[PDB]
Amino acid sequence: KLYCICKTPYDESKFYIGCDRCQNWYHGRCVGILQSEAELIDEYVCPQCQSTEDAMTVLTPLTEKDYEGLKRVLRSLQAHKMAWPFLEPVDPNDAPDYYGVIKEPMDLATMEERVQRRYYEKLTEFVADMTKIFDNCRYYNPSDSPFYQCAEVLESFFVQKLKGFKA
Amino acid sequence: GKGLGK
Ligand SMILES: [Zn+2]
Ligand SMILES: [Zn+2]
Predict the structure, then answer these.
(1) Which long-range contacts (CB under 8 A, 24 or more apart) does A28-36 make?
(2) A101 contacts B2 by C-beta, under 8 angstroms
(3) Which parts of the sequence belong to the Bromo domain (chain A)?
């Protein structure tokens, strides 16, 4: 009865564009799209639906192609200059109290094993394990320590590398 | 850092 982001009655004198996801119609004007502009995109996706698609990328099942992606992402992390602390499980000999302080240890080799055995079913689970690596480090190590700074840098890197991951 | 250190 009311349409578009503007919540107005249907007016057949006006140009509408239809969202291919929700099938609701939107004034071309309210979405910044002229008629000549609409004949160049194949599938319009409206503001509300688009943010839903954005949000659900981390929750949809990991495809075979996504798994190729996780392997690449992991490889770029393992190669990063700041990833040296995170390549393997912490050695108790290097930090005798570590496994008493850190309840859920995580590291890149363990994550590689998990990718190998297709342990992850959604992107959010992979991200959760990566986030554990960084949160543990920031928890165990002082803020002025290069270990902590390495976590800060690598997390920032990872967040960038994850943009446009999923189809 | 809650830990004794590395
Ligand atoms: Zn829509
Ligand atoms: Zn409108």
Answers:
(1) A30/A4, A30/A5, A30/A6, A31/A5
(2) yes
(3) 61-165
**CATH number of residue A41's parent domain:** 3.30.40.10
Distance between alpha carbon A42 and the CA centroid of its chain, in Å?
26
Report the SS3 class of residue A154: helix
Give distance in angstroms: CA of A9 to centre of ligand 2: 9
The domain tally of chain A equals 2
Task: Please give the DSSP secondary-structure letter assigned to residue A62.
Answer: P
Pair A16, A26: CB distance under 8 Å: yes
Q: How was this structure determined?
A: X-ray
Q: Which of A84, A86, A97 to probe by mutation at the B interface, max B CB count within 10 Å?
A: A97
